[PDB]
Amino acid sequence: TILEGLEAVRKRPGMYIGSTGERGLHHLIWEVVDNAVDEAMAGFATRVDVKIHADGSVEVRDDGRGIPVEMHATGMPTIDVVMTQVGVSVVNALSTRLEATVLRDGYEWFQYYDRSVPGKLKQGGETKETGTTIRFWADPEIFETTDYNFETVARRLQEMAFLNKGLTIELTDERDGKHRVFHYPG
Amino acid sequence: SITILEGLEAVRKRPGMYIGSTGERGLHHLIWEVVDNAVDEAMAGFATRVDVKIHADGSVEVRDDGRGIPVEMHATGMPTIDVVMTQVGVSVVNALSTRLEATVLRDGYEWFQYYDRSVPGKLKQGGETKETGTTIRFWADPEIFETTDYNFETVARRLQEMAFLNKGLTIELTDERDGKHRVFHYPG
Ligand SMILES: CO[C@@H]1[C@@H](OC(N)=O)[C@@H](O)[C@H](Oc2ccc3c(O)c(NC(=O)c4ccc(O)c(CC=C(C)C)c4)c(=O)oc3c2C)OC1(C)C
Ligand code: NA
Ligand code: NA
Ligand code: NA
Ligand code: NA
Ligand code: NA
């Protein structure tokens, strides 16, 4: 049933991200970034870092509270409930791979998803830091393009910074070295 | 299999036999081993660039554009990359790390592997690419080392020396803890 839900996304992605061209591809970034910016609005995060990797993956890191990793009532870690059932599960469904690294509850935690199928959540080292890193690889079977446009992403992140005064958003493109930092005082 | 585990446990039992000591000098030996493997690939004529990143979580990432660690099934019934990470020089880094991740571009694909206290995960085949190279990210074990705090200046001075001794190689160093950076490239 959880698998059927994610397969429904792959069958009709337009129902979830509007379309499967360049605008649909960029929706994967908007979803993950919106989740990070939500932590800034909530008063926990101060910075969101976005990287476009040369392998076509995108990495989004925040210093918010960290996606909860404790066991959920449904019998999987809460992070796995999130990545299989809520908004960002669409990103998992339409990615060949998603990795999550969370700083929370005194530890670094590692999870991966292989075509949306969770690995086993691993507890890493001790840390007082909190936050979330998500890295995802858009599925080229789904999208008409896997080419992210730096200028499109930069203009969106600059507007997000303008609506969320005091938030810093950094964007790095590892394909060609482009780098921008956006922030408005607040 | 018993022998492979015995070998890694021998390293944890007496790390001084393999990296000299378990203070700061010993800690920095983990970076030298991984970087040495990348620089050797470059100067054997297969790579042009080595990128070293000290992450805010205390992990170190070393990336090269060399041939990539071989990933094909080995005669022993595990992938060659798992033989490498459990048996050769870099297996000392794996043994003295709580975690090691390898991302290899080779044989037409991006490949993902992890090691939890040197125990391999299942090697995963990712997307298609002609590109080749190796990325290793490792988390030094604080139960082994007296300190896990790498020194930017120590790393920079050693990488500068490596670039000087290997003319034509680019070595880039970034430290996400405090934003420090260097790029070394001696023409040759
Ligand atoms: C993709 O996850 C997103 C988050 O994205 C990021 N990047 O943080 C963020 O947008 C937002 O994050 C929330 C949203 C609400 C709470 C929240 O209400 C918390 N309060 C708790 O006491 C708490 C503790 C454990 C727990 O399982 C839950 C409910 C489960 C949630 C929020 C998934 C809540 C908390 O600690 O963290 C929260 C966090 C991190 O919602 C998620 C989890 C869907
Ligand atoms: Na949507
Ligand atoms: Na959403
Ligand atoms: Na935080
Ligand atoms: Na990883
Ligand atoms: Na290469």
Residue numbers in the entry:
A (entry chain B): 18 to 102, 123 to 213, 246 to 255
B (entry chain A): 16 to 102, 123 to 213, 246 to 255
Sentences from the paper on this structure:
Superposition of the two mycobacterial novobiocin complexes gave a root mean square deviation (RMSD) value of 0.688 Å, indicating that they are closely similar. Residue Arg141 (Arg136 in E. coli) makes a key contact to the aminocoumarin ring system of novobiocin;39–41 the direct interaction between Arg141 and the aminocoumarin ring system of novobiocin has been crystallographically confirmed, and mutation at this residue leads to resistance to the drug.
Gyrase is an essential enzyme in bacteria and has been extensively studied as a target for antibacterial agents;6 gyrase has been described as an effective drug target for the development of new anti-TB agents. In addition, we present crystal structures of the GyrB N-terminal ATPase sub-domain from Mycobacterium thermoresistibile bound to one of these compounds (Redx03863) and also to novobiocin, demonstrating that this novel compound class inhibits via a binding pocket and resistance mechanism different from that of novobiocin.
